[PDB]
Design a protein around this ligand. Sequence first.
Ligand code: NAD
Ligand code: NAD
Ligand code: NAD
Ligand code: NAD
Ligand code: ZN
Ligand code: ZN
Ligand code: ZN
Ligand code: ZN
Ligand code: ZN
Ligand code: ZN
Ligand code: ZN
Ligand code: ZN
Ligand code: ZN
Ligand code: ZN
Ligand code: ZN
Ligand code: ZN
Ligand code: ZN
Ligand code: ZN
Ligand code: ZN
Ligand code: ZN
Ligand code: ZN
Ligand code: ZN
Ligand code: ZN
Ligand code: ZN
Lengths: 333, 333, 333, 333
Amino acid sequence: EKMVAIMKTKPGYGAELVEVDVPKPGPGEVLIKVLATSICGTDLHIYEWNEWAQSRIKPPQIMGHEVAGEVVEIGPGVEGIEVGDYVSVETHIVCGKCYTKIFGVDTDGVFAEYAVVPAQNIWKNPKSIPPEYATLQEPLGNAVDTVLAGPISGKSVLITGAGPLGLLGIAVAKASGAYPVIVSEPSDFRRELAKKVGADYVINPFEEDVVKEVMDITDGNGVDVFLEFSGAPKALEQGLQAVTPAGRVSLLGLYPGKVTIDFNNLIIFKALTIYGITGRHLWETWYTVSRLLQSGKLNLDPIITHKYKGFDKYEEAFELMRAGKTGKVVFML
Amino acid sequence: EKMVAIMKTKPGYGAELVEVDVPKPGPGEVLIKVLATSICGTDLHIYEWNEWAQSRIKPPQIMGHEVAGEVVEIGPGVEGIEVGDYVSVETHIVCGKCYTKIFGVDTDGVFAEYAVVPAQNIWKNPKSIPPEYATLQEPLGNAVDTVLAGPISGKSVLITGAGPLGLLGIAVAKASGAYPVIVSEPSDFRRELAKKVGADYVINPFEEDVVKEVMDITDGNGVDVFLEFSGAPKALEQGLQAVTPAGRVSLLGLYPGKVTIDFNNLIIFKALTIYGITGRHLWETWYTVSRLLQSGKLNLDPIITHKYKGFDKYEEAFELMRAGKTGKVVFML
Amino acid sequence: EKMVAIMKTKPGYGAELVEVDVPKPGPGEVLIKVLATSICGTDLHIYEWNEWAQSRIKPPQIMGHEVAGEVVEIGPGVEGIEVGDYVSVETHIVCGKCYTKIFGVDTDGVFAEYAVVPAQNIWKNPKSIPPEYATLQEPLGNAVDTVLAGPISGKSVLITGAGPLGLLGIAVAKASGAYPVIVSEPSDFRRELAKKVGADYVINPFEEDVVKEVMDITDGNGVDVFLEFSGAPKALEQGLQAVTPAGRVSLLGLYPGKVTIDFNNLIIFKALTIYGITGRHLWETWYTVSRLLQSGKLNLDPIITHKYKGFDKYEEAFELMRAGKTGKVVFML
Amino acid sequence: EKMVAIMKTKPGYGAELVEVDVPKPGPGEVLIKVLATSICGTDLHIYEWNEWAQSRIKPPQIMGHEVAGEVVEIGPGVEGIEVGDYVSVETHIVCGKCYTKIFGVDTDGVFAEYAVVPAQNIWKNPKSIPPEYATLQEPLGNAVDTVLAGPISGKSVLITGAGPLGLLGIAVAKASGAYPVIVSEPSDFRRELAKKVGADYVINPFEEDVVKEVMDITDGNGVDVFLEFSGAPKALEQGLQAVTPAGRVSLLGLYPGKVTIDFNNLIIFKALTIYGITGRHLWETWYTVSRLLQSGKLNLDPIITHKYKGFDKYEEAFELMRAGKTGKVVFML
Ligand SMILES: NC(=O)c1ccc[n+]([C@@H]2O[C@H](COP(=O)([O-])OP(=O)(O)OC[C@H]3O[C@@H](n4cnc5c(N)ncnc54)[C@H](O)[C@@H]3O)[C@@H](O)[C@H]2O)c1
Ligand SMILES: NC(=O)c1ccc[n+]([C@@H]2O[C@H](COP(=O)([O-])OP(=O)(O)OC[C@H]3O[C@@H](n4cnc5c(N)ncnc54)[C@H](O)[C@@H]3O)[C@@H](O)[C@H]2O)c1
Ligand SMILES: NC(=O)c1ccc[n+]([C@@H]2O[C@H](COP(=O)([O-])OP(=O)(O)OC[C@H]3O[C@@H](n4cnc5c(N)ncnc54)[C@H](O)[C@@H]3O)[C@@H](O)[C@H]2O)c1
Ligand SMILES: NC(=O)c1ccc[n+]([C@@H]2O[C@H](COP(=O)([O-])OP(=O)(O)OC[C@H]3O[C@@H](n4cnc5c(N)ncnc54)[C@H](O)[C@@H]3O)[C@@H](O)[C@H]2O)c1
Ligand SMILES: [Zn+2]
Ligand SMILES: [Zn+2]
Ligand SMILES: [Zn+2]
Ligand SMILES: [Zn+2]
Ligand SMILES: [Zn+2]
Ligand SMILES: [Zn+2]
Ligand SMILES: [Zn+2]
Ligand SMILES: [Zn+2]
Ligand SMILES: [Zn+2]
Ligand SMILES: [Zn+2]
Ligand SMILES: [Zn+2]
Ligand SMILES: [Zn+2]
Ligand SMILES: [Zn+2]
Ligand SMILES: [Zn+2]
Ligand SMILES: [Zn+2]
Ligand SMILES: [Zn+2]
Ligand SMILES: [Zn+2]
Ligand SMILES: [Zn+2]
Ligand SMILES: [Zn+2]
Ligand SMILES: [Zn+2]
């Protein structure tokens, strides 16, 4: 039995759409049939084959890691998982000995009709959640950990960056009672998506003064919460200036390099609480994500800008991403 | 200049609708013109004149404490407040020396066309918030402190009691991303109001087994959060049984007397976190309430079951309350 | 090769000192040579063979669970543990699937010269910690989770109950900067031990009014923290009355049955934070315990009232415990 | 009646020891007789008259702000304070309207035999606390807010900087159960003081590799808590590298200017919690400080390196400070 897969055949740009054997689940593994799979920034780096990918990816290897699938076969030893289960996957494979590898980065991914998954990284989904939303749970998890690092209901918020993560952040913040949610994004396309998801105010940082606008919106008090989703040094500076004294900051975005910041006046004298964010990858975050999805309060439709039937148009998909003309791209099978 | 007022003229049942002089604001006080004022359980006790009222109320005295008004005159010394300001009032008058008196309980209230208010208890409202909603801010504050005593977004919740406070609790929980929100209320009328506000599931405790139903809804895990809004001993027992181990409980409801509870198995062995709730009455809670109101996410319309024009039908209003046929009653001026 | 062991041979009172084969470690297990082992309340119940033991203990079975030992042999599969390692044991054997069995309760214990231990429940000890202190880590863990459930440095504290757990609680609280630490204990012997460990004030509840004394010590403010280590209904009532409004309570002690408490005035109106405590049994607590032991700040010497060489005098040990004439009893090998 | 005072007579270096009228307390003020007063970094800047002082100090003005005194006269309106009360002073005079001025910076200080103090900034001291320790409460408050920003008992700690604040930090951390407490300080004199206060390990950053040493002490895990008390850019970098992933950081030290930091790897990928610290100046911190002082657990003797009788040798005192040959200097009256 053969299957179609988007694979990084060798070092270099792009990828190849090929047909390989349907993998067989070994001890502690299960086989899932892919229903939907979405593309992430990490996948784009592997595609473009940058410095990062050039040092960690070992081709040939199937790409992708975000998925919504159905278990079709369970390997030896597996317990608690049955054929027919609707599932998604946690990408971080931890060892549990730390004081490890990433699914779809150090192993074959889910951009194929079927995929092998370690049983321990399986998350069961309620049948009511559509595949196109279920596949966004890993990214949603990062957004949830960023937004909910502290209290947010009835709090004013400044979100810098409206890429897919920032958009998911807006959706989580609004569903969590945040108001007003202010979003700064230079891209016209993404700034408009932010508005559609639910941003109460949007700011174009290349045409307006972010801090001034925030001060106007918050009557000079600043925002209670600043969430950094862009990775732009300037945005970090602006948010630290815009956050109210004793406010909370969550940093998810990754910068080009080191950043030069006025710690004395913006962090120390303002007595801020700053949380560095990276994926929890523990079930607690997944429980929160699942419930928010089941609640119907997450306005995700505007975020899914592209839905492809099959993997055939993969090249077009990756190109649209590089051109910054996408929110979230999903492959439907 | 005279004004109409609902006043507790003397000890006994009921109250009198009279006309008295429009009060004049003294040092540290301001005069507000009432736009809307709502009735609370405390007001009903003063009306019925029970043991509690019989020991603290000193008639004659104007009733009521929940209000939305406009400042028409500022007394001597007052700073930061100007004529024309749209405001609401914090009822607890604290001393700031503790490690005191209640507005509308130990002083004249707001069930009149005008009312004198200590400047320090004034809260300025954004002009966008309608009077009928602004007057519910004190009760909303109790609901916010109960619901938001801990994390709630993407958490399952059991609310026992759907009286006005429980209804406001449901509205706050839903706006805060809680799901599913399960409400137990024996009253058919109020149980239906709960559904209209936004309860995901409702339970009639006199016809169903609360714990069983919760277990069914949560697949045997129990709820992450239990909020007690009824004051019924049985409900407290049920919630403690229904809450997941290591879950959180917020207790607002007041019981008839002491309660007998299995601490060993329900609290200690389940490692619960229990918060006793009573009104914050500090600005932080008011900031949260104001933002949630401005967000438009609080489904308050179903809670306001009665809107009276003027105070003339006050007797009918209080009677409907005793008959348990109301959510929140508001007087519009 | 044979070894001496204190074993519950059959249903009934007492136990037998016998000689059995030195167990052999199977897959995922290791064999430790016991250096020191201490007696706990649970062991006494198994000895006395009460209702609880009569329903869970399946004789014949080696008693005891608190230990400090040295690994002498590692079973198949075991990684991270080498022969010669100085270790202690976590008693709760969890499954990791919950939203299980207890070492020394549902399995052979450590009251023997050698004992088999699941590798996953092994905790490595720094060689600087003496065996007689290392064996008290499980009980210390319960005390740490109770005392440190919230902030405690520079906080006033009321501890009810000075049994071994309460004594360990006093030691942890003092090492953590608590002051003053007030201890209520009716037993003259244990009340004196409390003073020796480091209690700043002691109260004899059968001769004095606990709440009055606390109020005198705290100038009418009450204590910031109330830790219940007795399991006595009256003590729970007194602590809830003695704790300052908005204070914190940690409940570890287990009551005879249900308790009748004034929730309205003592918990709700005082806006308390109540934590039900039961053993963490996760590494975080063990890390805290280990560091506190290494710090030399825990005054444990007064708590170890009896040190026996070998198991021969086991009957005398258990009897002294029932007579309430002990703090902590340790068997040295 | 005249009194001696250390006063900044005019712009420029140094100060003058003069005799002026004993001030009289006006409305809301009280007069205290100084028993002990200590010198702070702020006082040294006013003495040296740097850019900061050159822009905020308005001479003539009495210097100093840290004090332990006795109330000798109460002004009009004052309540709750009686002649004979042993007190200390909170330096931050807040307005309570914020979403202001500093005692001893924008007003006459306490380096005189008597001083006028706003009643609201008075803190009553237990008579058991010696004047030389009571006068260190404001600085201790900064140290407490830094150390206790999060949990610390049984946690490993790295403190960078052993100036007076860092020394007080070490004393608070040890009294709070921290272990091991690692201190990095280039000054031989201060590094030795750190050891005397109670540091478990000391590091000379100009002769050793701080991170390497921390890794050796913590077996490659890093410290649970990093407290920055130096204000040195390099120290901030080292602590962020030395703190364990998901650890906590408290920043009190103020840097020369902006700092360039690797946010991606040290804060974001390590999921740190960072607290910017500046003085609480609210009673809660004062309550904690007072109890820790009453506990006798703070090893403050080594920190007080100089005790002067009277103000006569003020010039010598300030010079010793600039030469970095002091811990804390106290004037005894
Ligand atoms: N810490 C973690 O664990 C983690 C995990 C995943 C992704 N990330 C990071 O989160 C960030 C967002 O990732 P993404 O997938 O949405 O990528 P993205 O490429 O879509 O970038 C986010 C957005 O920032 C916008 N932006 C650029 N300069 C800006 C400025 N000055 N102000 C406001 N917005 C500005 C861009 O136009 C873009 O739309 C990245 O830095 C990514 O590397 C972090
Ligand atoms: N702690 C505080 O600071 C504070 C402040 C205000 C009000 N309260 C209390 O909050 C509670 C609710 O007040 P409210 O104004 O909404 O009053 P309410 O009279 O409307 O009572 C709440 C609801 O509980 C329902 N109920 C009765 N038995 C029940 C059961 N077994 N299970 C579920 N529901 C049951 C009643 O039918 C009613 O609709 C009261 O106990 C009130 O005294 C507490
Ligand atoms: N929740 C958990 O996970 C857990 C785990 C272990 C032990 N425990 C419980 O912790 C408690 C203490 O256990 P222990 O081993 O120290 O037992 P213990 O028998 O030594 O009892 C504690 C002390 O309470 C004292 N006491 C009795 N009445 C009192 C009163 N009115 N006021 C003050 N003190 C009073 C007794 O004299 C005794 O010294 C028990 O209830 C035990 O069952 C709970
Ligand atoms: N944020 C606030 O509210 C606040 C309030 C008061 C003081 N402070 C600041 O706290 C800090 C400490 O003040 P202080 O009075 O103890 O002053 P201090 O002059 O005594 O300086 C602290 C110590 O840092 C040491 N140091 C210098 N470079 C170092 C390095 N690379 N590694 C380790 N130690 C190094 C110095 O030798 C000195 O002993 C300062 O930056 C001060 O301005 C902050
Ligand atoms: Zn992804
Ligand atoms: Zn704009
Ligand atoms: Zn434009
Ligand atoms: Zn990741
Ligand atoms: Zn994940
Ligand atoms: Zn009310
Ligand atoms: Zn039903
Ligand atoms: Zn029915
Ligand atoms: Zn109230
Ligand atoms: Zn209030
Ligand atoms: Zn034990
Ligand atoms: Zn006594
Ligand atoms: Zn006696
Ligand atoms: Zn246990
Ligand atoms: Zn344990
Ligand atoms: Zn100072
Ligand atoms: Zn060294
Ligand atoms: Zn040297
Ligand atoms: Zn200051
Ligand atoms: Zn202060």
